[PDB]
Amino acid sequence: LKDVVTREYTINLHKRLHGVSFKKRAPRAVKEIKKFAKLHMGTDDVRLAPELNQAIWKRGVKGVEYRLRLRISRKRNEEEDAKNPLFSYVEPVLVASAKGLQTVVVEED
Amino acid sequence: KSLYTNTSRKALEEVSLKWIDTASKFGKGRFQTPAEKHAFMGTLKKDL
RNA sequence: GUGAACAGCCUCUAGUUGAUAGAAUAAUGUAGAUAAGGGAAGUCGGCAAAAUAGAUCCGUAACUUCGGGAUAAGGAUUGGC
RNA sequence: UUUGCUCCACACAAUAUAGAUGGAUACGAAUAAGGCGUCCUUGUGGCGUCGCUGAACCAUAGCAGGCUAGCAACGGUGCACUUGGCGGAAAGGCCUUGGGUGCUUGCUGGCGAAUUGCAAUGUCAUUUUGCGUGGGGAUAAAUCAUUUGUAUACGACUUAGAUGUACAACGGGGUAUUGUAAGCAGUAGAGUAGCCUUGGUUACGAUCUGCUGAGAUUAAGCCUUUGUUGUCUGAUUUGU
């Protein structure tokens, strides 16, 4: 619960972005991925890799992929103030297709 | 139950159903049963 | 680049990414659209909107100051290889 | 719950009073008719009686009602108990049983009262609440936050959530939409350009054909789930 752990998930950005304004789809995808990481790792401090932001914006503001495969690593941080000592870091996995993949524990990184 | 005794020949009619639609309401449902769907469509690539 | 084109649309060099934001997606709006069948019955009034539209070929009336009217009207064709 | 809550009794405090100062004392119906009593032959009966207002009835004497002694009679009345019943229109009252106890002014005595100074409401009722002393009893919820979308401008509404026929994210299946994916192959292809063992071969070629009703998408307010992974005690407030 309050430990370090890395898991790989698939997020259904299609259903999360259904009906969203085109100029807001990619920013909405960023916020939905933050909500996803907060739901699965319980951290308010979610940090998105710039490579993940590139993957989100890869096809413009409206062309967000239907499914994104993310590696979410809940890691502990210790800094100026406590402020949610656990934070989650989200990176892309860079698989060929983000289809037919279940949540797995990484166990190595 | 009704609050009065309706006798209007629209009540008092004995209805016998001849058929009940069970095609999908999630679209323009074409088949009543998966068996009828398989019989119409023949063998598909996934199975059937 | 397309194209007749300094049109529209996309791109290079250069420049900017500046307009208070976040969350929802009721009514009524502003702006943009669609609509069965009918087709101006609406309305002071076809207002608004729709329809037409480029190019090539054919065809083109009354009237006329003989210069026009005229893209009259009305049709056909258009991609790729 | 920094010893909370509630019920009974008691004391002490406040708090006021739409206004106690003997008793709201129960048929129903009619009124050109009735009530009561009585009788029989039980009726729309006979007889008697009454009203002419409650000006009644009951209660009512005692230091705001003290302390005592008797007589008479087994009555009245307060009280706490106790027996059984009836009453739902708002019953929360009505009746009833037995014993105990107090008083009795039904009658006859004994003692007390004063000086509140010639009157001054001259304080006697009931309404809530609080606190303390004992005794009995009980041992939750709601809201925020998260979540749902049968809801929705915001509030509000409807849902779910402490270890499960739980919930969620994925994945699987069903359903549905479109219309046959990429890739590879072809003695398909209008033809065109080369080569020579001149019937083939190489190159270009919209397109066609096969794998392929394939591929893609499918809840975001679709249905379903023996799979995978995870989550499940944060905040505020509420007492008769």
Ligand SMILES: [Mg+2]
């Ligand atoms: Mg929409």
Ligand SMILES: [Mg+2]
């Ligand atoms: Mg339907």
Ligand SMILES: [Mg+2]
């Ligand atoms: Mg040109």
Ligand SMILES: [Mg+2]
């Ligand atoms: Mg129409």
Ligand SMILES: [Mg+2]
């Ligand atoms: Mg029409």
Ligand SMILES: [Mg+2]
């Ligand atoms: Mg017409």
Ligand SMILES: [Mg+2]
């Ligand atoms: Mg008219």
Ligand SMILES: [Mg+2]
């Ligand atoms: Mg008119």
Ligand SMILES: [Mg+2]
């Ligand atoms: Mg007119």
Ligand SMILES: [Mg+2]
């Ligand atoms: Mg106009």
Ligand SMILES: [Mg+2]
């Ligand atoms: Mg013309």
Ligand SMILES: [Mg+2]
């Ligand atoms: Mg003319």
